[PDB]
Symmetry: C3
Subunit: 219 residues, 3 copies
């Protein structure tokens, strides 16, 4: 049985959303994203697994925060991050991703974002709705980006950061195994003040999961 | 003189919209689409002939149903189904069509939908806002799709289904004359429980207009 | 120091917005666009220089006119006219430009409009939200369009019309120097009743700045 959606506060105006999917043979697996408050609206980092979970997140921001989701960013073209795009579009959310993420999404039967983030070179950063978005180079995926929230100093690593003290790498079918550890180092060096690090597939932690991920994926 | 727009109830939460256009030499000709209620919003099947008629439909859902139109689907790339796209986009409606419909629309000076429905193979179906959307193969047009509403068992055949007991085929300049009768059979077999069948260019009827259309367009 | 945004009434339901940018070595330079009231909403001609200025314009229409901006048109692919596209998209404004303007925008790192205006041949006109949009041919830029408001007879010339009695042409790096004066003549002949003419980079004036622009850019 699929576990229900969860919301947890990470800092002032910053919330984690978590949805679950049963993936045989191992069963329920979480994916995490963020809701970030922006005055009288909010912005979203990643969908959950599907439209229904994602619609529940939009409703929660509207009805609990009283700060409806205006716009969203997507941290790579897999179904845990873009599985609920149709729900975002029907609910009036303005969606953003890199051109490479959009192209990969279309190829895979995912829906692309409506707007392009112009960050394609390794190390490129842009400011978006008070967040710093960084392309650290290919790692978990060639298109993975990370998102830093500088008020609370929360770094969203998404699926590029592995959970806990695992030594498993997750699904690596389209990973950049050669560059992933450098990409982690690039993110860690870009955002040195962030002591809260969020992976997609585990619990919120500290910078030890940057160090551990870089070690377990290093050549 | 162009006859005005009309709304008629077909079943619980399902409404037909009808707009008219004077087309010489024969004069006024109707086109039909649907409004389908979805909780506290509604969804739209097809525009009417133009922006003004389509804006009237959007206003009617907002002000009479108190269920504003959130999203729409378009059943092929002709001006009776996509003539009012600009009005939908300006009124905040999130529009959906197949990739082939969008490509044909652009070619013809029509505006494409914002989102792609991923149904391109003959017989492919998807669920969309509680509706079943089917691509039955080429018939009236290569891109024609049909839409089934399973609560009331209403099958929207659009222009692929001819009205009444006519033997005329309408404009066949880009019809698939070889496959059209099979496409009708495919729709009839896919939705056997639907005893209400809606053509674009005639009155609501029963399954006899599926049988008649398949006969008059058969090789 | 960058001067703040300004709003001035030009006629019934027609407002000019003006934003400033410090461009060394000459300093602050204005750019002008329009807000045009449309019943219980408004439409926008051009962004200002950036997202922040453009968001201020959207808020002004919402809170002062009580006629929120529903849609916008963009008169060529430079940053004074499309520098605030991301703000328009996040604020729910439905954006329009020609296909050529969108293609040039993407090339230049600007964000394209969501919808295409189908005017690509010299002299083509379309009606859009009660306005007449004309492509007069290449002048300041190959893609420049002009916008006429026929109730007050206000012609928005954008950057194709130079300010005042200047003899400077502005930045001409991608101008059509051969056709620009004819393009001005084309606009003047298309909208003979407009005695208010708005350039992007100077004060509102009369038809003397059409005549002066045509003279100073003539072969
Ligand atoms: C569909 C996701 C995209 S990152 C995936 O590949 N999974 C599912 C959860 C983690 C990882 C895995 O295979 O271990
Ligand atoms: C413009 C429409 C698109 S199905 C059309 O071709 N018409 C107009 C109404 C019916 C049919 C015909 O020519 O008979
Ligand atoms: C960025 C704008 C686009 S029309 C520009 O080229 N400018 C800046 C203001 C006028 C003109 C100039 O160089 O003089
Ligand atoms: Cl779902
Ligand atoms: Cl995936
Ligand atoms: Cl963990
Ligand atoms: Cl119209
Ligand atoms: Cl047509
Ligand atoms: Cl869009
Ligand atoms: Cl009939
Ligand atoms: Cl800005
Ligand atoms: Cl520019
Ligand atoms: Cl001046
Ligand atoms: Na989805
Ligand atoms: Na900080
Ligand atoms: Na239209
Ligand atoms: Na049923
Ligand atoms: Na901008
Ligand atoms: Na007039
Ligand atoms: Zn992934
Ligand atoms: Zn993942
Ligand atoms: Zn048709
Ligand atoms: Zn038709
Ligand atoms: Zn310019
Ligand atoms: Zn300019």
């Amino acid at each position: 049985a699929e576990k229900p959606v969860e919301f947890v506060k990470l800092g002032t105006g910053v919330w984690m959303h978590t949805g679950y999917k049963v993936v045989p043979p191992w069963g329920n697996i979480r994916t995490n994203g963020l809701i970030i408050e922006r005055g009288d609206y909010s912005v979203l980092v990643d969908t959950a697994w599907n439209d229904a979970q994602t619609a529940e997140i939009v409703a929660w921001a509207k009805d609990t925060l009283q700060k409806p989701i205006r716009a969203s960013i997507h941290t790579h073209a897999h179904s845990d991050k873009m599985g609920g795009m149709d729900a975002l579009h029907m609910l009036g959310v303005e969606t953003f991703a890199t051109d490479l993420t959009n192209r990969l999404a279309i190829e895979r039967g995912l829906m692309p974002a409506k707007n392009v983030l112009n960050i394609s070179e390794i190390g490129s950063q842009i400011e978006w709705e008070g967040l710093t978005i960084l392309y650290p180079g290919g790692g978990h995926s060639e298109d993975n980006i990370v998102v830093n929230e500088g008020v609370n100093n929360i770094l969203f690593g998404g699926c590029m950061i592995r959970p806990g003290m695992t030594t498993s790498l997750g699904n690596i079918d389209d990973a950049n195994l050669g560059y992933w550890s450098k990409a982690v180092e690039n993110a860690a060096n870009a955002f040195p003040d962030s002591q809260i690090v969020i992976p997609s597939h585990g619990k919120p932690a500290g910078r030890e999961i940057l160090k551990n991920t870089a070690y377990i994926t290093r050549p």
